Design an enzyme around this catalytic site. Structure first.
Site: not given
Ligand SMILES: Nc1ncnc2c1ncn2[C@@H]1O[C@H](CSSC[C@H]2O[C@@H](n3cnc4c(N)ncnc43)[C@H](O)[C@@H]2O)[C@@H](O)[C@H]1O
Ligand SMILES: Nc1ncnc2c1ncn2[C@@H]1O[C@H](CSSC[C@H]2O[C@@H](n3cnc4c(N)ncnc43)[C@H](O)[C@@H]2O)[C@@H](O)[C@H]1O
Ligand SMILES: Nc1ncnc2c1ncn2[C@@H]1O[C@H](CSSC[C@H]2O[C@@H](n3cnc4c(N)ncnc43)[C@H](O)[C@@H]2O)[C@@H](O)[C@H]1O
Ligand SMILES: Nc1ncnc2c1ncn2[C@@H]1O[C@H](CSSC[C@H]2O[C@@H](n3cnc4c(N)ncnc43)[C@H](O)[C@@H]2O)[C@@H](O)[C@H]1O
Lengths: 259, 259, 259, 259
Positions: A45-46, A117-118, A143, A153, A161
């Site tokens: 996926d990388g 992804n993000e 904080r 996706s 996680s």
């Protein structure tokens, strides 16, 4: 059609790529890594994420395909053994396209990024403290260690996680999760992940320190003198070339439950 | 217009209701609790939920409004002090309607239910074990205390307590959360909440025991000889009468962060 | 020595038991299920838990041993194939004893119970609401599904599913975890699991309803007209007969990571 | 007695310190910041943590006291208004000492550190991957953002934010929590916090990259060419001077529930 193939760059992936190129040579298929219509990624996926970012200025002109030589492949549909079947199917134009939502990040000092992804935000090492503003409405003072904004996706990646929900990629949305929030008498966050529709704008604003480490997928990036970080669902989409049924929830089952 | 008013049934709520009815008497407004076009709930969210279930056979003909005498009001827009302003605005037809998604539960031995918040499933007291099937695909064998399926507006309720994401109610979806899942060498669940779009069907199927306690919002209900429990986003929607801006994320802020 | 053997009661377990009894017949070993010094359990942890509760009035006179025919065995040290080696080692008195902490539950209307894993409290089906009092100090008003109090060996069971910490059983303590706590503007709990030393007393007190479902390990039990539920670390301990090294953290690894 | 006073260094704290020193001048009390027997901290927990680390080579010769000018004070017993009562009580030797457990960190390339709250480990920015070894037994390969090892008094700090249990500081233990663990088909961690007794040794060992950011309380610290990171409960303890009853669970209530 114009196509190119990126490889993870190990022996296995490089040889599979050479074999596919040889196989494409027997059809009306031109290797063009400047203006491809099909981008094949061979690796994990990388590798797939790198392919996406290589070609993000021509997303509406490209359909992506992934072969996994790993390991996991959320963006792989294909095992190495099926590489020949893929060459054949792809050569004959035998596919429908599926589109997934993307995330727009705007960093104001404007730099804009697109994530598959993000995008995450953390300190330069001191305390993280930011104000979270949703559609110009002040929502909370966060904080903690950081925040993560995920595409649908992407929900199976960093988001998962952090306790985020897994969302079907037909839903046009983005999801905000917390990293190690401080909650006490004084200091309060929502705790829960938040899912935002298209056209909602989430803005992060500094309280003291204005230096942040910002990530966009595999890219990470100290930003100095930041005024604002803005998130919204992109108008742009990633298109996949798709050749058989392999539903999202089955991909999730295969990656997390058993395969 | 035809209207009715339900009350929590304490002194405060009953008197507010009597005063609103007197106020409606000065306009072209007929009290009709059989076929109302407007349903006003005075109490908490529990009272509101009861109003919804009282009138779920005429959801497309009704617009709902809530006054909170509590406590919290996620389905309240109004404080008791503004009851007069509401009578006035409502009498003059001064409002736009907002629709929220609902959840269809089908229990097969078929009984069908509609939830505004959620439907949950737990054992009759022995082990809970069910097979989770998504669009006819076997996804996992769930072992634990139970499962919760939430609407978007429901995500702030039971769902939130179970670690679920908060979802904006413009998103047509449902969210599945776990209660105390068993995870070890043998026994595996996804762990994460799951968000499903319209037209996805999640089916729960018994493994040993076929008796379950099923809840639909405030209704709970031992079901015997169950073959299947099916969840999908309903084609039906709840309509609210809305008189000013009070965004979902501000309601969330007010209920969880500070007011 | 006096010994007895409990079986899960399937073909496999019953035959292993018959073979061990035959093997014990070749040594100075008397079968006595009234006043045994060694209690051998053949089955799963459920069978083991039943053995413990069968003999809880003579805990200081008994050493326990478990053979797993499952599945998992946190209280199993032994596979069925090693049953002969065990007969031999046990006959020759070839073992050191290891003690684990237990949990005392007192229910006041007094009924007292001893748990090896945990005791939990939930409603009779309405809201759960209880006041949590620690050493006579009011700590919180808990609103949610229930509460779980775990021994150290119990931390791998229900506790783990509720987000509790795994604690080494040499630590004389008990651990309190929440089930689906309600947290908002109004209603506040600590959220986090709490670990208490010996001599600390945690008391649960009713707010409205005084009827609760109370569990002690596998026993569950509607209690009516409850005034108080009291938890503390017991002065009593369970003794295991132990024949080789099989550390707690290795048992945890084997049960949860890989075996 | 020999004493010193550290201040947060704002107007409020500096003036309170000057007033206490003037008040101590009326008793047999010598200001000595080289070899004090009493260390008074005026500020927040950050100031308190700095005081502890200032004097960690003479922990067995010092009793600590905290005055909170914040904000929260888990290591404060005292408000600024009671500063005079404290001078008086302290001058007359009117106190019993309470000891809390500490955490020993050993970094092998040996550097050893003592933590009052916790020590954490994260990457230099690439992937974190470490092998977790408990008493020479390989327990798991951790992939994620990092790990946190907490003392009992530290359990209310970073640990709490990571989902850790709150532990009473009479328990001689340390607690390991995960930051954003990756869990899938391939990659597995325990998930749960782990509580270790005295004499247990938890060792972290690199898999690829050997550069880590290590924190000890407020100190953080890129370590290069790391072979091992070792955690155990210290033989050393912090001593507090204590003047009235203010139980740990009441401090927790006051800091997290309401004050
Ligand atoms: N979409 C998706 N789902 C599941 N897994 C994924 C996905 N994309 C990548 N990956 C997996 O991420 C790993 C490295 S990809 S490099 C950049 C990504 O790392 C991910 N990352 C970074 N830190 C974490 C943590 N702490 N947990 C989970 N994922 C993380 C994040 O999503 C980034 O986009 C490898 O196991 C891939 O199979
Ligand atoms: N939509 C919504 N958001 C937030 N809070 C809500 C909502 N609807 C109701 N409530 C609150 O639920 C409480 C009682 S309503 S009676 C039935 C509801 O109880 C809720 N419930 C049941 N058990 C739990 C737990 N354990 N945690 C949270 N919520 C729970 C569930 O959503 C049911 O639909 C009261 O505080 C209401 O203000
Ligand atoms: N000590 C221990 N550790 C791990 N697993 C255990 C332990 N004791 C029993 N078990 C496992 O519990 C299962 C049934 S034992 S019957 C009573 C126990 O059920 C357990 N239980 C009940 N509901 C749940 C949930 N929801 N999650 C985890 N565990 C649960 C609880 O600890 C009770 O003491 C079976 O898989 C056993 O191997
Ligand atoms: N013992 C204790 N309990 C509760 N709160 C504490 C404690 N010690 C310090 N603090 C609070 O930490 C804040 C800054 S102290 S500077 C170093 C500490 O920061 C803490 N830290 C760092 N990142 C986080 C996060 N993400 N969450 C919670 N705590 C964190 C960590 O425990 C370090 O020891 C401030 O609100 C203090 O009142």
């Amino acid at each position: 059609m114009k196509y190119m193939i990126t490889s993870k760059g190990d022996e296995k992936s490089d040889l599979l790529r050479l074999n596919m190129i040889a196989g494409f040579g027997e059809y009306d298929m031109e290797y063009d890594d400047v203006e491809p219509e099909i981008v094949i990624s061979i690796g994990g996926d990388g590798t797939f994420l790198s392919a996406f970012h290589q070609y993000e200025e021509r997303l509406d002109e490209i359909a992506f395909i992934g072969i996994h030589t790993g390991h996991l492949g959320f963006y792989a549909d294909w095992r190495p053994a099926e590489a020949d079947k893929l060459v054949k199917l792809l050569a004959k134009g035998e596919y429908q396209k599926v589109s997934y939502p993307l995330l727009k990040t705007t960093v104001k000092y404007e730099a804009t990024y697109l994530a598959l992804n993000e995008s995450t935000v953390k300190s330069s090492g001191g305390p993280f403290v930011v104000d979270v503003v949703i559609n110009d409405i002040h929502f909370e003072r966060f904080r903690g260690d950081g925040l993560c904004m995920s595409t649908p996706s992407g929900t199976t990646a960093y988001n998962k996680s952090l306790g985020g929900a897994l969302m079907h990629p037909s839903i046009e949305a983005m999801q905000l999760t917390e990293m190690a929030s401080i909650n006490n008498r004084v200091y309060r966050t929502i705790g829960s992940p938040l899912v935002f529709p298209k056209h909602h704008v989430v803005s992060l604003q500094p309280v003291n320190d204005k230096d942040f480490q910002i990530s966009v997928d595999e890219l990470s990036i100290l930003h100095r003198d930041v005024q604002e970080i803005r998130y919204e669902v992109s108008a742009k989409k990633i298109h996949f070339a798709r050749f058989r049924s392999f539903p999202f929830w089955r991909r999730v089952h295969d990656s997390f439950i058993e395969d």
